[PDB]
């Protein structure tokens, strides 16, 4: 348990604006979905998606439910849904990097063991 998957980090840059459209909400299953407005290339391509308790470090956390969601549609203002299953706590879902970055306030309250 608590394994570490540190392969490496290295990607190219993009040029498109992003914004949250579907607020993340957990269900009985314990999974949250994230949807935003993908502009520019409009896929099919991989979009930026990450979440962490802090911003300074923004360490990689959460589980991987989706395989490889991409924008197949050709039209503009095309969006897609994703599957996320973070741990029991509070994170900050972020999409795309830049000046017009976007984040949310995902907090969970309902436990007994204080870490």
From TrEMBL:
<comment type="function">
    <text>Plays a role in the inhibition of host RLR-induced interferon-beta activation by targeting TANK-binding kinase 1/TBK1. In addition, recruits the host deubiquitinase USP8 to cleave 'Lys-11'-linked polyubiquitin chains from caspase-1/CASP1 thus inhibiting its proteasomal degradation. In turn, stabilized CASP1 promotes cleavage of cGAS, which inhibits its ability to recognize mitochondrial DNA release and initiate type I interferon signaling.</text>
</comment>
<comment type="subunit">
    <text>Forms a heterodimer with NS2B. Interacts with NS4B. Interacts with unphosphorylated RNA-directed RNA polymerase NS5; this interaction stimulates RNA-directed RNA polymerase NS5 guanylyltransferase activity. Interacts with non-structural protein 2A. Interacts with host SHFL; this interaction promotes NS3 degradation via a lysosome-dependent pathway. Interacts with host CEP63; this interaction disorganizes the centrosome and inhibits host innate immune response.</text>
</comment>
<comment type="function">
    <text>May play a role in virus budding. Exerts cytotoxic effects by activating a mitochondrial apoptotic pathway through M ectodomain. May display a viroporin activity.</text>
</comment>
<protein>
    <recommendedName>
        <fullName>Genome polyprotein</fullName>
    </recommendedName>
</protein>
<comment type="subunit">
    <text>Interacts with the structural protein prM/E complex, and the NS2B/NS3 protease complex.</text>
</comment>
<feature type="disulfide bond">
    <location>
        <begin position="14"/>
        <end position="45"/>
    </location>
</feature>
